[PDB]
Amino acid sequence: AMAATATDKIGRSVPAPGKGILTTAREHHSSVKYASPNLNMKYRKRQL
Amino acid sequence: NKLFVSKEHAPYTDELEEDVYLDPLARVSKDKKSGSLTFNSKNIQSKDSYINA
Amino acid sequence: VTREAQIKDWVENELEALKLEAEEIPSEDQNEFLLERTREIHNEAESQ
Amino acid sequence: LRAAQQQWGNDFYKRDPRIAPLRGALATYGLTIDDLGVASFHGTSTKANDKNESATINEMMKHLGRSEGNPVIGVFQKFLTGHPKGAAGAWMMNGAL
Questions:
Q1: Do B52 and C36 touch (CB under 8 A)?
Q2: What are phi and psi of B33, to 5 degrees?
Q3: Which of D15, D28, D43, D90 would bridge C47 by S-S if both were Cys, CB 3.0 to 4.6 A apart?
Q4: Residue D41 DSSP one-character state
Q5: Which of B15, B22, B46 is the best residue to mutate to test the D interface, defined by the most D CB atoms within 10 Å of its own CB?
Q6: Gap between the Cα atoms of A36 and B34, Å rounded
Q7: Taking CB atoms and an 8 Å cutoff, what residues of chain B touch A29?
Q8: Which residues contact D13 (CB under 8 A, 6 or more apart)?
């Protein structure tokens, strides 16, 4: 359902791992007070 | 002999390193002091840019 | 341009569907819920 | 039609900042971040990796709002087999199935 490789920046220093993959969870929690309709299926089914 | 200027420190600082990583509307910006392009904690998951994009 | 007609009137059918929803379910803590759903509709319109 | 599907069924979180790629990866089956049962770690057995690999798994559950007290279960395939420098993720995807 998902595959994603990730890297910091330019090939700089190989033998040390880092944050890279954490970006597979980049989402925005600035305003979570309202409900996001797209997460429901009963709503996405009606549009379809 | 200064075409290739190797970065020394990333646009984020370690305390902001993972805060950038999935607040996905985190845009780098200019720093009035340093002049370089670095990430500020003032616009990382700042909810003004976090939905209008 | 034919599908754009389907998409144009689609939001005018969607934003009106917020008014039957957005001024009856919540209180006047509204311009944060509206700016949540009116953006999502605007974005669900773009990717449409 | 198979274009309206991927708008509302498969790639409905692409053009959305507030649905993480891993959350919408599962949210397309009615799964939640809580249903991510297991995490087959790379688990190379180096002192820097396992400290870091475990670290990063935490935040992406810490950030996605995994239920408190619902941890993912570390599967460290490499204790048997070792590190097949390149073959790794295909042994641990092999086992994960």
A1: no
A2: -75, -65
A3: D15
A4: -
A5: B22
A6: 39
A7: 23, 45, 47, 50
A8: A38, D19, D21, D23, D24, D27, D28
